Design a protein around this nucleic acid. Sequence first.
RNA 1: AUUAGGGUUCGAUUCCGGAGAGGGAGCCUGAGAAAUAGCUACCACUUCUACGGAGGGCAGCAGGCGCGCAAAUUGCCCAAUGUCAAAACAAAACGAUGAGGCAGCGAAAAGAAAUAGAGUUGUUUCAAUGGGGGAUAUUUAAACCCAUCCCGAGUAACAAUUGGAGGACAAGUCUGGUGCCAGCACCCGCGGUAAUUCCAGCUCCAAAAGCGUAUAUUAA
Lengths: 122, 182, 52, 142
Amino acid sequence: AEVCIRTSQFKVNKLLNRKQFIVEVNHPHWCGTVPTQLIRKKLATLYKVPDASQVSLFGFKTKFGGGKTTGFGLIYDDLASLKRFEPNYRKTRMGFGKARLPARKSVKERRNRNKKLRGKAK
Amino acid sequence: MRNYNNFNRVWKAPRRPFEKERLDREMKLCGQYGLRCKREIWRVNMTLSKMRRTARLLLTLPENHPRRLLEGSAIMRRCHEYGFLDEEKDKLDYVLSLTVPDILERRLQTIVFKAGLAKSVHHARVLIQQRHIAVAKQIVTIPSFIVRVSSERHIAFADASPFGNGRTGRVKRVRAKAAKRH
Amino acid sequence: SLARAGKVKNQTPKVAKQEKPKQPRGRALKRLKYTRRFLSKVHMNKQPPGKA
Amino acid sequence: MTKTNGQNAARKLVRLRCRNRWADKGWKRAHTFSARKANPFGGSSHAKGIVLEKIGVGAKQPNSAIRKCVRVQLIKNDKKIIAFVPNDGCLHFIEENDEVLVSGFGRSGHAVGDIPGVRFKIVKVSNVGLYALYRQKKEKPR
RNA sequence: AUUAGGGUUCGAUUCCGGAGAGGGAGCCUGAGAAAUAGCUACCACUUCUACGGAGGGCAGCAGGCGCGCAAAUUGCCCAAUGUCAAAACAAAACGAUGAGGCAGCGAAAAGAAAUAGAGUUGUUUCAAUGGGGGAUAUUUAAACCCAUCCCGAGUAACAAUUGGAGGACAAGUCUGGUGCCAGCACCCGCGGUAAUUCCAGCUCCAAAAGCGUAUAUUAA
Ligand SMILES: [Mg+2]
Ligand SMILES: [Mg+2]
Ligand SMILES: [Mg+2]
Ligand SMILES: [Mg+2]
Ligand SMILES: [Mg+2]
Ligand SMILES: [Mg+2]
């Protein structure tokens, strides 16, 4: 059960301080789907990135019939650059994201009540 | 609302639903190629009638007309790559001579049986539906797949099937589980 | 009138179904018809003419 | 020697066709409003009503039978019609003051068969299909 | 939509244009309105009150009542597409958005497709696979579906239906019951004691996860 990785369309983005590419994974005779964590470690080793936390991988699609999976990947220059530019929902998947806000319905009712009042008591 | 995905139909029912001559002929084709319902024949009719309609319009146009030089070689190329016409026929008036069996032989179900992977058309149908046949290393599960000429030499058993390089089947594994339970 | 309503339907003696074994639904049924009608004045189901 | 033929004679040909289309009985019915007012249905395919009573209609000669029917008052416009009740039995399923769904008889307002002057048919009683009750695939509610 | 050609017919409804916000007038602000989740009055309905008075406008999204032959959840989210704006993102430090997106209900309609397959003697074997049940996991804003992978079929009960069998029109001189009654029948026609047509059983026919009926409309 080996894994082979090939990156198709490589582009370097000086703005946003990252590199973008398409990831292709070949896993013949593998049981199930390849976890995203495993692909990150191989990608970091292949591209000589120091910290594996600098790699971001988006939604993967499995080919019909098995043995191949394709997705999208990002490699940031620094760890600070990743946290500054990444969307919150992807940062939550990694493990360091802001907590979910209260339900929108409660926010709507609170603001509508305050529309009546005017003073410092609103 | 505000959705712009297209769709169309691919078949139509015949006039005169109870014509005895047509009923016998359609029953002939159904048993010879292992089809499921008369709808599989009728979608072949619509493909054939569309091809003849565009050929008839092109032949009315004079030769050396731009819409005849282009779109005339394109349709003839399609027939050659898929195998409906042999390479010897290059005239644009041999498209009008195509028959229903000429298309039904290029289905994956008929190709698998003729090649030798299956012993009958009905055995071929279940093999395709059970993920045992691969075309150029790709598993195909659709019996109506139309095989290209260049793809015929690459039709073989799938590497993930027990008949190829895959693990054992369901009954062999179930028997093994029972043997280990004992 | 209106009294003779449903006369014959209620008069008919009740006969139960036979509950035969099932049939090959699907592509297998089309195969069965093809092998019966062909490859063993063409007559479909023929009654015993000994009645008359 | 029946029609004009001139190259600049389009106006005559247009007027001639317009007046002669009215002689078509089918064309006239679809382009006037008298039929729609006459139709107990307001141009719909079905209507609902209340059963007033059960009647029997004699079959026209040379047939001989008593065809079972009911008279219905429609809810949308309070018009009264006569509807045939098909199939053996099937009159016991219908009681007075029941709601029914009525449909056409298949000839677009023309009478059908040996039933004199009947152009409607019952298809539902008490929100349950009449044929379903006849086959015993459902039970009469309430 | 239908159509050899010429034609006939539909277009409330996604894009463009117009008009309206219960009805009817009038107006302020403003670059722009004769604006209606702005104001003023009258008419028709209607809510609260301590009776002095004060309010209302779903032909926005969900919902409810009526009307009818006739049409969904008082759901999740701003992740995407946009709009506004005092505004990149991030850092104590998260703009709004029923536009819009996502799912629930949904045989309007449209694709692909299971309900087995291969054999030995005169009824007995062999493999294969889905529906289904789960996953280190994958997808997703979060879920769900798809895709990927294993414990599982022999009445493989994991059991296919809807209309028909005189003619038009494919398919029974079959067997009982009824006796111009009951009923069938789009039309022609069956039924009055030996019914190819009704009510049933059997056997056959057509289309098939679909098949009948009604009303419009195109061809015929
Ligand atoms: Mg497999
Ligand atoms: Mg028009
Ligand atoms: Mg008035
Ligand atoms: Mg609403
Ligand atoms: Mg019968
Ligand atoms: Mg008899």
